[PDB]
C-alpha cells in the first residue's frame, strides 16, 4: 500500500457524463501494456501493439459513456510518440507536461479545465488535484472510483501541506520507499501530532513545473493517418476498425453534446 | 426548384421503401411530365424504373425542363417512416436541400442536403415477352410472402394459360397454381416459358401491395422477369429481374 488512508465512493458513469478528465498518459499506457493480452499483443514485424489496442478500444468506450478524455504526457520513447500520433489522428486532446504528467493532470483540474485527474496512482492528490478518478483505464465488476481531496483532507483532519509530508514519510518517487519502518497509518499519526520536526521535495509537490495549456477540444478523427500507424505499420485488423472508427466519431456527437449539459441543481 | 404534394403519403412511402431494398442511392428525376426514379442494384440483377406522373400529385410544379435530386434511400425512408394517418406529404427542392413536409394536425418538415449520384441507368430493355399475365397485387403479395421462407430460387412457369409458382426447398418442392379458371389471375396469354429467379429479389417487391391495386407480370425462358405494378392515375413501378 501507498495510500489506504481512504474512504472513497464509487461513481456511476451517469455522474461522469459530460466531464473532461485529465488522464495520465504514462500510467494509462502501462495499464494497457499490463492488461489486455489476446494470445503481449504482437504484430507482423514482431513488436508490441498492445498500447494501441488500449488507446483505441478503451478510449471509444470512455467517449461513448460521455467522458471527454485528455491524455497528459511528460517525458520506449517511440511507443509514447506513436501513442501521441494516434491520439492526434483520433482528434482526442493532447497536453505535453514540462516535467511530471500527473502534476500537469492535477494542474488542469486545478485550473478548472478538467473535472478530475485520472490515474491508478494517488500522486495527483499531492499535486493539487481537486478530484481523483480511478479505474477508467482498467460479483467483482470494476467500476469507476472517486476520491475528493476536499473530503479526504476533512476526514483525516489535515491540510495539503500535511498530506505532502505524510507522502514523504510513506515514500514518493523523489524518496523511493520513504522512511523505513513507518507506514501510512504511522505517518498519518505522526503528522497529525507534529509537522515533520527533503526540504526541497515539498517544493516539488507544492509548486512544480506545470503549464497553462493553450486545446483542449475534440477534433475530427481522420482515417488517412489512423490506418497508417494501426492497420499497416503495427498491423491491425481493419474489419474491426471499420465498425469501431465509425462509432468513434459517432460517440463524439453525444460526448461533445453532453459537455454543454447543465445540471438541474443550479436552480434549487 | 421543384414542388409536389402527395395526398396518400403512406402509399408513396411504400414505393420508396421497396426501391430501398434494391438501391442505397437514387435520383428523383423531376420533369414537367412527372417524377421518375430509376437505377440498377450493386449485384446488377435488378433494374427498376418507377414513374409517377404529374397527375399522381395534388398540385405539381417544376421551374425547369429537368431537375435531378440525389438522395440516400435510408435517410428518405426513415423520414417517410414518420408519416401519420391523416398527413399529406409535400416534396420540395432548391439549390442545396431536399425537403419533405408532413401536413396534418400540425406541420413538420425534414431537410436533407442534395447528393450527387450517377444516373446510369440503364441498361436493359428492348424486350418482347412470350408470356404476359394480369393479376391483383394483393394476391401476388400473398403467394410470394408465404413462399419466401423456402428456397433461394423461385422457379415459375406456364403451361395451359395457367401460371405455376414453384420453389425447391430443403425437403420437398411446393408449387402454387395461379389461373383465371382459379380466381387469382385476371388475364393471361402466351406459351410456354420456364424460368427461375433469385427469390430474395422477387420477395422484396411485395410491399408494392400497399401502393398498387393491380399489376402485370412478364416472363420468358432465358429472359428477365418484368413486374409492372400499376400505380394510381396511370402511374407504374417497373422491376426487371435477371434470370438465374
Amino acid at each position: 500500500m501507498d495510500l489506504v488512508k481512504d474512504v472513497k465512493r464509487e461513481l456511476s458513469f451517469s455522474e461522469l457524463k459530460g466531464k473532461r478528465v485529465s488522464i495520465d498518459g504514462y500510467n494509462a499506457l502501462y495499464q494497457f501494456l499490463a492488461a489486455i493480452r489476446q494470445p503481449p499483443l504482437m504484430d507482423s514485424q514482431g513488436r508490441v501493439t498492445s498500447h494501441l489496442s488500449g488507446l483505441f478500444y478503451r478510449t471509444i468506450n470512455i467517449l461513448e459513456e460521455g467522458v471527454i478524455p485528455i491524455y497528459v504526457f511528460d517525458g520506449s520513447n517511440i511507443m509514447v510518440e506513436e501513442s501521441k500520433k494516434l491520439l492526434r489522428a483520433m482528434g482526442i486532446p493532447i497536453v505535453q507536461a514540462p516535467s511530471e504528467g500527473e502534476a500537469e493532470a492535477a494542474y488542469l483540474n486545478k485550473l478548472g479545465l478538467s473535472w478530475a485527474a485520472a490515474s491508478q496512482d494517488y500522486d495527483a492528490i499531492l499535486f493539487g488535484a481537486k478530484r481523483l478518478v480511478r479505474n477508467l483505464t482498467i460479483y467483482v465488476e470494476i467500476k469507476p472510483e472517486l476520491i475528493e481531496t476536499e473530503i479526504l483532507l476533512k476526514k483525516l483532519g489535515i491540510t495539503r501541506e500535511q498530506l505532502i509530508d505524510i507522502g514523504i514519510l510513506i515514500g514518493t518517487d523523489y524518496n523511493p520507499d520513504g522512511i523505513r519502518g513507518i507506514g501510512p497509518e504511522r505517518a498519518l499519526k505522526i503528522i497529525k501530532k507534529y509537522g515533520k520536526i527533503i526540504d526541497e521535495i515539498r517544493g516539488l509537490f507544492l509548486n512544480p513545473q506545470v503549464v497553462k495549456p493553450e486545446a483542449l477540444d475534440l477534433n475530427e478523427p481522420n482515417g488517412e493517418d489512423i490506418i497508417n500507424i494501426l492497420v499497416y505499420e503495427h498491423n491491425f485488423s481493419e474489419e474491426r476498425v471499420k465498425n469501431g472508427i465509425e462509432r468513434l466519431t459517432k460517440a463524439i456527437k453525444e460526448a461533445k453534446g453532453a459537455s454543454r449539459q447543465t445540471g438541474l441543481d443550479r436552480w434549487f | 426548384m421543384m414542388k409536389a404534394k402527395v395526398i396518400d403519403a403512406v402509399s408513396f412511402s411504400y414505393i420508396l421503401r421497396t426501391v430501398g431494398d434494391f438501391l442505397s442511392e437514387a435520383n428523383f428525376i423531376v420533369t414537367k411530365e412527372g417524377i421518375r426514379v430509376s437505377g440498377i442494384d450493386p449485384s446488377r440483377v435488378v433494374f427498376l424504373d418507377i414513374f409517377l406522373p404529374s397527375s399522381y400529385f395534388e398540385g405539381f410544379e417544376v421551374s425547369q425542363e429537368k431537375e435531378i435530386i440525389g438522395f440516400k434511400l435510408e435517410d428518405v425512408n426513415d423520414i417517410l417512416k414518420r408519416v401519420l394517418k391523416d398527413d399529406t406529404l409535400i416534396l420540395s427542392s432548391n439549390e442545396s436541400k431536399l425537403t419533405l413536409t408532413f401536413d396534418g394536425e400540425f406541420t413538420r418538415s425534414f431537410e436533407l442536403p442534395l447528393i450527387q449520384v450517377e444516373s446510369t441507368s440503364p441498361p436493359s430493355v428492348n424486350l418482347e415477352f412470350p408470356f404476359k399475365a394480369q393479376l391483383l397485387t394483393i394476391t401476388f403479395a400473398d403467394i410470394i410472402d408465404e413462399l419466401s421462407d423456402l428456397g433461394e430460387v423461385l422457379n415459375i412457369h406456364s403451361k395451359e394459360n395457367k401460371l405455376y409458382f414453384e420453389v425447391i426447398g430443403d425437403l420437398s418442392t411446393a408449387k402454387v397454381e395461379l389461373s383465371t379458371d382459379n380466381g387469382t389471375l385476371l388475364e393471361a396469354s402466351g406459351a410456354d416459358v420456364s424460368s427461375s429467379y433469385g427469390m430474395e429479389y422477387v420477395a422484396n417487391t411485395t410491399k408494392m401491395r400497399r401502393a398498387s391495386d393491380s399489376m402485370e407480370l412478364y416472363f420468358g425462358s432465358q429472359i428477365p422477369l418484368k413486374l409492372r405494378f400499376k400505380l394510381p392515375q396511370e402511374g407504374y413501378g417497373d422491376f426487371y429481374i435477371a434470370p438465374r
Binding site: 456511476s12 445540471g263 434549487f268 | -
Partner: protein, 244 residues
C-alpha cells in the same frame, strides 16, 4: 400508521409506471399536505415528480408524516402487475397493504422500509413561455427529433412555437400554434432553449396513460417543465435541464 384512498386506480398505476421511467425503485412520501414522489437522475439532467394534494383524495388519515421506500424493483413490479376502480393504501408492520375495489376486490401486500419524510426540492425559476397540447403531438415530435439529432431547440416565433433539430445540414422543423395543434398558448417574452433530444423523449414517453392534456413550459436558457394533471386531480411532472 395511515389510510389513503384515491378515487381512480387507473391514474394511480399511471403515476407508478411514470416514475418507473426514471428509477424503477419508487419512494412515496406521506406528508401533511398530501403525497409526493421525487427522483433526480444521477446526471441531474432529468427529474420526475408526482404530487397528489390532500383535497384530491377520498380519504387521507395520518398523524405523523413518514416516508415509504417500496422494496426496490420487485415490489414496484408487483404493483404494475395489477390492472374503473378505487385504490386504498394502508400500513402493515413491515410495509403496506393495497386494496383495489371495483364489485370486485383484490389485495397485494408490499414489504417496504419506512423512514423520515423528505423535501420536495424543485427548480425555483420563472418560465415566460408555456403551452398545452395532446400527448400524441408530444410523442410525434419526440420521435422526430431523436431521429434527426442529439439536440433539440425549442423557441418562440411570433405567435408560434418553433421546434428544431439537426446535426449536419439535415434538419427538422416543427411549428405549433393556437388551434394547430395547441389548445392554449402563452408567450410572456421571446425565449429560446436547447435540450437533449433523448431526454425530451424520455420525459414525454413518461407521460402516456393520461387522457388529460399536457402543459409544456420553458424560458431563455432555462429548464423545461412538462406536466399533466390527471382527470382525478394528481400531477405528474417532468423537468428537463437545458444545454448551454
Amino acid at each position: 400508521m395511515f389510510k389513503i384512498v384515491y378515487p381512480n386506480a387507473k391514474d394511480f398505476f399511471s403515476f407508478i409506471n411514470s416514475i418507473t421511467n426514471v428509477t424503477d425503485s419508487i419512494i412515496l412520501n406521506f406528508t401533511e399536505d398530501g403525497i409526493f414522489s421525487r427522483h433526480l437522475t444521477e446526471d441531474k439532467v432529468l427529474m420526475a415528480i408526482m404530487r397528489i394534494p390532500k383535497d384530491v383524495l377520498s380519504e387521507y388519515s395520518i398523524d405523523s408524516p413518514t416516508s415509504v421506500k417500496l422494496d426496490v424493483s420487485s415490489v414496484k413490479k408487483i404493483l404494475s402487475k395489477a390492472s374503473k376502480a378505487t385504490i386504498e393504501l394502508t400500513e402493515t408492520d413491515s410495509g403496506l397493504k393495497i386494496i383495489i375495489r371495483d364489485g370486485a376486490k383484490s389485495t397485494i401486500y408490499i414489504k417496504a422500509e419506512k423512514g423520515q419524510v423528505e423535501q420536495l426540492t424543485e427548480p425555483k425559476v420563472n418560465l415566460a413561455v408555456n403551452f398545452t397540447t395532446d400527448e400524441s403531438v408530444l410523442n410525434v415530435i419526440a420521435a422526430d427529433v431523436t431521429l434527426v439529432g442529439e439536440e433539440m431547440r425549442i423557441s418562440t416565433e411570433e405567435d408560434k412555437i418553433k421546434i428544431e433539430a439537426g446535426e449536419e445540414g439535415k434538419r427538422y422543423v416543427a411549428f405549433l400554434m393556437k388551434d394547430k395543434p395547441l389548445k392554449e398558448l402563452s408567450i410572456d417574452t421571446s425565449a429560446s432553449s436547447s435540450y437533449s433530444a433523448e431526454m425530451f423523449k424520455d420525459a414525454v414517453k413518461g407521460l402516456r396513460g393520461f387522457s388529460a392534456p399536457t402543459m409544456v413550459s420553458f424560458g431563455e436558457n432555462l429548464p423545461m417543465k412538462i406536466d399533466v394533471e390527471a382527470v382525478s386531480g394528481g400531477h405528474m411532472i417532468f423537468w428537463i435541464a437545458p444545454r448551454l
